[PDB]
Symmetry: D2
Subunit: 131 residues, 4 copies
């Protein structure tokens, strides 16, 4: 499961999105250390605050199944450049993924940006800050 | 899969919760029309706003897999009476579940309250309100 | 400050809304026991999850100023019937307003529905449930 | 109103926080181009997802009043180093503040980190990505 293949997983996951308000579909594929893939997509709500993102859908799915060791996360959307995870997703990612996990961002036209969890949100607010 | 059995599913799902800040674990089990069960649990974050609930974890998991027809949702937590879904969950439920879906609420001591999606959030804000 | 006058306050507050994504403006006016009025409006974000509602904007404003005793909350939007607070707002309302506070819901055509905080979200999840 | 004075404003705003669940109070002070200061503080909810942060409380307050031109934002909390805005706040900040606005982060022991909005969340997801 290289990043190329993980991207195709996120592209497929994108087609499952429920986004009738923004008409903006997002897909994500999370790869565990054991090689298992969890797909995620954004799921909207008439009350915008309750919309959930593809990145978080995939992570929530994994953690709920007991999988908490990851190696890579691919995210895709029909944006101008590689899709940029929103702050809420970066925050959840910084909590649920170890700082070494690779984050692969792409769009639907071959644009690819790769960065680590730490780079996605440097100095992220964490539990250590609470105590 | 009766409500008794769906409750045991939610009780198991509760043990998967990642809740190091509140130490309050919640479990949920969503039953589709075809009899498939999706488990969900709350997943917290040092930045409280980003915490996700068991009800929504289960629903997000189902919808992302392509399952959008449900019949029942069980929710469980160690509360005094049947656990009460927070407003955000009721909002997502009212969007992703048809008004006839049965919502079963319970705690860890046999308290059981049953209600429909419509009753969970009567006159819920919806897409019809946007247009 | 009767409900009629508080409604006009919410109608004015609605014109301050920043809602370029939904084009759906909402207004709210919160009346304290001492007769002070706090206006609120929805404020959106390209990343939908981060949108904030009029009801919560008004409440957040009041609480931050040290005002925590309220008597009435008016909410208005261009909906078919009285605007329905989303679950997230009902949740925050049930926490920050005592159960006796009156919630006045209306649209832009004279539709008016009045209910108490308790009625807005009966048996709302609360701190008592955490401990 | 230099950053030193804006910090004292955020320190005062911190004392208004309603944070009975985390016992972690945060303060913020937003300075407009015209020299007006809006204070903000975190406001929690038994249902963690609904908690709101100091940064966003201040911004929501300003925007609702019609003030949309800012020059600086100070944030303070009792953290080990300068308090780090959570992803949700950085997201709202990148939307409501122009990329040149100065963000001043500090704790209660003189630690000070200064950065621009762009630096707070480089390449933030924006409306341009939606269309
Ligand atoms: O973090 C990224 C950016 C945001 N989108 C979302 C949620 C929402 O349904 C839509 C518009 O913001 O894209 C994602 O799904 N992931
Ligand atoms: O809707 C219900 C009530 C809220 N809890 C949550 C999320 C959070 O991690 C914890 C404390 O609010 O319980 C749920 O998981 N489901
Ligand atoms: O609770 C009510 C219903 C929801 N809207 C919002 C937030 C968002 O900007 C827009 C579309 O959901 O209306 C409110 O402002 N208040
Ligand atoms: O962005 C910063 C970091 C997070 N906190 C919050 C919200 C919550 O009440 C508490 C614990 O996460 O700190 C803030 O208020 N601002
Ligand atoms: Zn996101
Ligand atoms: Zn919930
Ligand atoms: Zn709302
Ligand atoms: Zn924050």
């Amino acid at each position: 499961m290289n990043r190329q293949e993980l991207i195709t997983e996120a592209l497929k996951a994108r087609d499952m999105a429920y986004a009738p308000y923004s008409k903006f579909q997002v897909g994500a594929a999370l790869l565990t250390k054991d090689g298992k893939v969890y797909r995620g997509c954004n799921i909207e709500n008439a009350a915008y605050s309750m919309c959930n993102c593809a990145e978080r859908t995939a992570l929530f799915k994994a953690v709920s199944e007991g999988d908490t060791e990851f190696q890579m996360l691919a995210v895709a959307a029909d944006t101008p450049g590689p899709v940029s995870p929103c702050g809420a997703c970066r925050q959840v990612i910084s909590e649920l993924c170890t700082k070494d996990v690779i984050v692969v961002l792409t769009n639907l036209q071959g644009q690819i940006k790769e960065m680590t969890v730490e780079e996605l949100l440097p100095g992220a607010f964490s539990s250590e800050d609470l105590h």
